Amino acid sequence: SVPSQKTYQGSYGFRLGFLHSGTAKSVTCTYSPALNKLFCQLAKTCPVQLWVDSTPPPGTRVRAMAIYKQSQHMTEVVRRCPHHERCSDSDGLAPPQHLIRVEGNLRAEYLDDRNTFRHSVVVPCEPPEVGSDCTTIHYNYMCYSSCMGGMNRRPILTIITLEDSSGNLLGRDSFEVRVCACPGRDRRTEEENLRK
Ligand SMILES: CCN(CC)C1CCN(Cc2cc(C#CCNC(=O)OC(C)(C)C)cc(I)c2O)CC1
Numbered sequence: 700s701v702p703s704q705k706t707y708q709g710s711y712g713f714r715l716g717f718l719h720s721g722t723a724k725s726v727t728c729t730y731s732p733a734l735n736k737l738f739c740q741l742a743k744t745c746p747v748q749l750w751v752d753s754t755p756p757p758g759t760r761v762r763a764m765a766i767y768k769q770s771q772h773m774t775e776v777v778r779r780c781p782h783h784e785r786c787s788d789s790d791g792l793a794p795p796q797h798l799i800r801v802e803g804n805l806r807a808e809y810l811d812d813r814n815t816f817r818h819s820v821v822v823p824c825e826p827p828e829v830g831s832d833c834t835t836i837h838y839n840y841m842c843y844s845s846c847m848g849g850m851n852r853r854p855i856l857t858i859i860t861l862e863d864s865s866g867n868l869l870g871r872d873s874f875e876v877r878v879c880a881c882p883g884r885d886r887r888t889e890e891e892n893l894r895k
Pocket residue numbers: 749750751752753754755756757758759824825826827832833834
């Protein structure tokens with residue numbers, strides 16, 4: 700089955716936010732509002748902001764999952780390729796098969812769904828640091844979009860869900876992801892193609 704990608708703010712007014720990192724050739728992570736698409740280098744830090752209009756209950760959690768964007772691939776589980784799943788680059792917490800990791804959160808949990816077999820990573824929802832207006836999660840993407848035997852050049856979507864302590868839906872947002880060597884150039888290219 701295919702998880703929903705329907706944007707849903709819910710009772711707490713949940714939505715994502717992204718930094719404005721620009722498109723210099725050196726940039727390692729950059730987000731295109733026009734394309735709703737994050738472009739990032741392999742295994743580099745991707746800051747994703749969580750915004751709400753009101754405080755969700757204690758025990759609320761935030762889950763990330765990847766799916767293929769194209770209709771003809773949506774039913775296939777997104778996973779790391781046969782090379783990267785074996786490169787012994789685990790942080791001690793993430794299963795080496797998982798495309799999406801959360802960086803620097805000891806409370807991150809990794810799920811292999813017993814029915815859909817899809818992978819996800821989930822952390823507790825927490826208020827912002829004192830002085831900040833939103834909470835930031837740092838994600839890593841552990842294969843290139845081009846990885847043979849894995850994503851193999853197929854575009855993916857990351858779906859971020861706000862959940863209660865039982866796993867019930869409270870909110871949902873999503874964005875496309877390309878993991879590539881030069882995110883700055885690729886974002887410039889794709890934005891120009893869109894303008895045409
Ligand atoms: C209009 C928006 N604005 C106006 C001033 C508020 C700014 C202050 N925020 C607080 C806030 C809490 C959370 C949380 C949580 C889990 N419950 C949890 O930790 O519960 C407590 C704190 C009760 C223990 C996540 C986020 I992202 C977040 O912004 C809410 C919005």
